[PDB]
Each structure stands twice: as C-alpha cells, then as structure tokens.
Amino acid sequence: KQNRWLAVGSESGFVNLYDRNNTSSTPTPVAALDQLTTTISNLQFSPDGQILCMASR
Amino acid sequence: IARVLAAKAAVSLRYDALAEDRDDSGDIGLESRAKVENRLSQLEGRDLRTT
Amino acid sequence: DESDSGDINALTKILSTTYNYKDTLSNSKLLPPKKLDIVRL
Amino acid sequence: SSLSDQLAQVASNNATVALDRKRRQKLHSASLIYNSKTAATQDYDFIFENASKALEELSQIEPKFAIFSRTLFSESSISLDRNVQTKEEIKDLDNAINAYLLLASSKWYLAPTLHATEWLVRRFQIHVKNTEMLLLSTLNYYQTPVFKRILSIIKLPPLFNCLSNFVRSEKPPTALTMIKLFNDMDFLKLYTSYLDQCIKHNATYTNQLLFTTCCFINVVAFNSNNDEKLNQLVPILLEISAKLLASKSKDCQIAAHTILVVFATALPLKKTIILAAMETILSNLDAKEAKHSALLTICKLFQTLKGQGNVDQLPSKIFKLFDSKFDTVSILTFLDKEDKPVCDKFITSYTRSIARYDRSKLNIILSLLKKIRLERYEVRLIITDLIYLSEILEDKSQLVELFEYFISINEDLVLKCLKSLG
Amino acid sequence: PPPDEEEQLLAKFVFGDTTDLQENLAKFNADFIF
Amino acid sequence: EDEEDIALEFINGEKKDKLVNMNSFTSMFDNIQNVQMDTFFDRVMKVLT
C-alpha cells in the first residue's frame, strides 16, 4: 500500500509533516510540530499511520 | 502597549517610506492596528487580583 | 397535576434514558485525538 | 458552633429591619442614581414621584410595564413594608418583582429603567433580598457603568463570589472572570432556571442570547481538556439547547445551533443523541435564518460521528422530516456554493436514505454525487446499496446512469463491490 | 346600606388600606404580563 | 481484497478537523455588541473550521 504521510525532522527540533496523498516543486506542510527542542533522532509511524512517534536522543 | 505599538509603528512607517508602489489606502496599518488592539484586549483582560 | 398516562421533546427524552453520554470507543476504529489509553507492561 | 457565628446568622436575617437610626442610614443610603449624602436626605414620596414618571415613559416604549402601575408602583406601595408582611405575602411580592426584572432586563440602556428601578431598590430592598435575580438580569451588561453601580450597592451571594473583588473598584469586571463565574456547575443550574423563565415568558432579546451563548461556548473550551467535567456539562447545557429550540423566536434557535455544534466537536456523542438532536432542530424550524444555520449544524454533527454506522442511512421518520424542511433543490443549492463546509458523511447517509425510501429522487442522487466529492469508503457504501437496488428494483435509465457515472470515475472500485456482492 | 364605590375609594386613601394591592399581588401570574 | 484493507481504507477516510482549545473563543466577547445572531454564529463556524 502507498504511504499517505511523510515527516521530515530537523536539528532544531521542528518536524514538518506532509500529506503525500495531495504535486509541485514546493509543497506546503500540513503542520509544523515543534514541541521537542533538540535534534530529532527517531521518526516512526504506527502501522495504521494514525500515530507519529518523534523522539530525540 | 508602548512597546507593542512602537514596533508596529516602525513596520507601518517603513512601508510608507520605502514602498515604490504604495497604495494610498493604509491597509498595512489597518491590519497592524488590529493586532495591537488584540494584544490590548488580552493584556487588559488579565486581572492581577485573585478571584 | 402530572401523569404520563416530529415531537420536539425527543432530545430531552434521550438524555433521560442514557447515563453515559460518550460513544463507546471500542466500536470506533479511529482513536481519540487528545487522550491516549496506554498501559505499561 | 461559637456564639459569634450564630449571631452572624441572626444579623444576616435581620439585614433590612432598620432597628436604629444608624441601620436606617446604611439601608436608605443605597442608591443607583444619587450619592450617599444626598440619598439619605430623600423621602419615599420624592423617590416614588420620579419612578412614577419613569414607569410612564417605559410604558410608552412597551405597554406591558403599565401593569406594574397597578401593583408595585401604586400610591399604596409607599406604605408597604416587607418586614411586617407574612411569608405568603412576601412570595407574592417576589413573583411581581421577579417579573419586572425580566422586562427591565432589555431596557437597561434607557435612563428611565434606572429611575423606575430605584423605587424597588429603596422601597422593597431588592438589592439585599432579590440579589440573585437582579444580577442575573443585568449579567450581560457587565461592562456598562450601570452594572458597576449595582455591584457597589449589593451583597454578593455565595455563587457570585468571583465578582467580589470588582466591588467598589475602578475597573469593570473582565470577560475572563465572567467565564469563571459560569464555570461553576451550581451557577449553570441557577442560570438555566433563569433562562428557562425567559423562554417561558418570551422575554429574551438578542444581547442576552449572544452573551449566554459565548459563556456557554467558552465554558466548554475551558473544560476541553477535562473529559470528566465535560460529561457533567452534557446533562445541563444540552437540556438548555432543547429549551432554546422550543422558542418560536428565531434568535433563540440559532443560539441552540451554536451551542449544540461546539459540544459535538468538543465531545463525541452517541449517534442516538445526534439523531435525537436533529429531530428537535427540525421540529420547530420555520425562520429562514434559522434554516440556514440549522443546515450548517446538521452536517457538522455528522462529521463528528466516528463509529460504525458513521454514514449509515437516516431513519425513515428522520428522513421524511428533513426532506419536508429541506427540499432537494435547497440542498443542491447548498452543495452548489463553493464555500460549503465538509458534509460528505451526511450526504452519504442522506444518499443512502434516498435509495431506501424514495425511488423518484434517484436522478437527484446522480446530481448530488457530481457536486460534492465523497471519500473512498463513502463511495463504496453507495455502490453496495445501488447494487442491491438493481436486483430488487427494476432496472431504470437513471439507475444504470448512476452506475455509468461510477464506470467513468474509478472503474476498478465498481468491480470490487460487484465481486464482493454477486 | 352598603357603601358606594366612590366612598370605597375615599375610604381606601383615608384609612390607607392595602388589601386591594395585596390581592393583585396574589392574582399576579407572570404569563399574562407577557 | 480483505476486511483489513476496508478498515485501513476507512482510516485514510478521516480528514483533519480543528480541535477546540481554551483560547479559541475568548475573542468573541470583544465584538459581541450590536451584532445579529446569524453573523455571530458564522464567526463560531469560522474558528471551528
């Protein structure tokens, strides 16, 4: 099955989340999660794609 | 409010002076005015005295 | 003075019968937004 | 209990007896128009004269005030003292006063209400006895100067404790504290009873509904994190919404729509509650402005449903009611406008309802599907039913056209339904 | 003979009767006013 | 096909909705004067959307 979500971490702690389902040279992220303050080290989705677990080491 | 208003004043002022094709409408000020009023209402809404 | 012996008062009646007003999350396949039901092992 | 505590209770009960001159000075000095020094010098005849003129002006604005000229603003009321009256007579007096506060609730902006009300403040001491009713009627004018004067001359009940600090204070009470007062559950029951009386009497006005709705909406916002406290709010505020929908006044109905929506998004509810909620919305839906707001509420409520049967068809009784209050052309206009909110789940339940109960609208189903894009599962459910229709219902030109529509869009999914069914 | 209505009004003001007022308070039922 | 794919096809069916927080309607009090009820109800919808 195709993935409908994509997450991109960052050293600053921001996590940009894209809706893969909906193309352009510049797509807008659906949300910009910034609760964490340190470098993002693990980005994992639940098998059903309903939970994103972002952790910093 | 003096700090907030002055900061928005510079933004509205710079757009007035350095804009090559400024429309004589004041839209940047009007939206800027809305932000300051919103800050004012929230700032005034807070009460120091315990309820 | 009182005896029991679209009708507007349907909403009032359904509140009386039901005590738990939240839909049971067991049937729903979609997890709740803000509360996570997590237990440690 | 200490002797002091019991005497304090005795002091409260005799607050308005006017035993000695000093007690008379405090009680008679309380005023809404005059300062303390001038107030003490005045006489009951002088106060009644101004009020009698004031009530006449109010009667011109609204004829209903003229009745109180017979009971509360009569010349004989000057000699009427509440303390010497028996318990039965006081209750009769309180009913008349409570009725007046409802009429005056909407006219506080007019000066004469301040002069008409001064007679009750001085003569009947409502600010000490009927303090709860006075505050509730003037609750929505909290930013006005008149509310400040009321707070100065009034002893606060236990439930209005949040307003204590703003007693004799330069600043008026803030909107945030008004939320805190409504947050208390006992106050909500108190306000609900007061709001119920207004609905019975058709005494409501726009400013009251606007203010009442906001505090109710804000209260849910403040308790959004607490699911348990939300569960306690559902019996009260939904019960209010049922009463508001009963009012023939359109403004009351729109407030119920505003209140109902926030709960559904704030709290998921059983489909039985949502179904019952619609029936009350549609039972008394007559005003056009209510009809617009209602239809927005109906779609929003379904969108919150997230359980099995999320998009199942409406019950037969509910569907007939919805069609009567909303013709197909009306919804085709609703789907027409570009700014339509997400309503696909309702349209799916509505779409499946059409097939089950009406065969003539099957052409309408084709039009609806084009206007709004349905989500993958919702399309699958519709195809599943229309397959059943073909076997039971006679094959029709419109029926095959709906299939042909699905042939054009996502032909593969049409096979999948056919494979699973036949 | 019983008093005339005019006498009843004058008797009310002279003696300051409040029974006419108190009766209306009991008869006061909120719905009619609205 | 299978039953699970139907269940997953339902999960993809969800579309995001704006949750209600504490500081979502507090601004309503500011502009609650001299406004018709319908226009107010629209503002509630707008913040909810």
From Swiss-Prot, chain B:
This is Nucleolar protein 58. Belongs to the NOP5/NOP56 family. Interacts with SIK1/NOP56 and NOP1. Interacts with the trimethylguanosine synthase TGS1. Component of the ribosomal small subunit (SSU) processome composed of at least 40 protein subunits and snoRNA U3. It comes from Saccharomyces cerevisiae (strain ATCC 204508 / S288c). It is found in: Nucleus, Nucleolus. Required for pre-18S rRNA processing. May bind microtubules. Present with 34700 molecules/cell in log phase SD medium.
Curated annotation (Swiss-Prot), chain C:
The modification Phosphoserine is found at S3, S5. Disulfide bonds: none annotated. Signal peptide: none annotated. It is found in: Nucleus, Nucleolus. Involved in nucleolar processing of pre-18S ribosomal RNA and ribosome assembly. Present with 9570 molecules/cell in log phase SD medium. Belongs to the WD repeat UTP18 family. Interacts with snoRNA U3. Interacts with MPP10, UTP21 and UTP25. Component of the ribosomal small subunit (SSU) processome composed of at least 40 protein subunits and snoRNA U3. This is U3 small nucleolar RNA-associated protein 18.
Swiss-Prot record, chain D:
Keywords: Acetylation, Mitochondrion, Nucleus, Ribonucleoprotein, Ribosome biogenesis, rRNA processing, Transcription. It comes from the Eukaryota. The keyword Transcription regulation does not apply. One of its GO terms (biological process) is maturation of SSU-rRNA. GO terms for molecular function: snoRNA binding; U3 snoRNA binding. GO terms for cellular component: 90S preribosome; mitochondrion; nucleolus; nucleoplasm; preribosome, small subunit precursor; rDNA heterochromatin; small-subunit processome; t-UTP complex. Belongs to the HEATR1/UTP10 family. Present with 18200 molecules/cell in log phase SD medium. This is U3 small nucleolar RNA-associated protein 10. It comes from Saccharomyces cerevisiae (strain ATCC 204508 / S288c).
Curated annotation (Swiss-Prot), chain E:
It comes from the Eukaryota. Disulfide bonds: none annotated. It is found in: Nucleus, Nucleolus. Belongs to the WD repeat UTP18 family. Interacts with snoRNA U3. Interacts with MPP10, UTP21 and UTP25. Component of the ribosomal small subunit (SSU) processome composed of at least 40 protein subunits and snoRNA U3. Present with 9570 molecules/cell in log phase SD medium. Involved in nucleolar processing of pre-18S ribosomal RNA and ribosome assembly. This is U3 small nucleolar RNA-associated protein 18. It comes from Saccharomyces cerevisiae (strain ATCC 204508 / S288c).
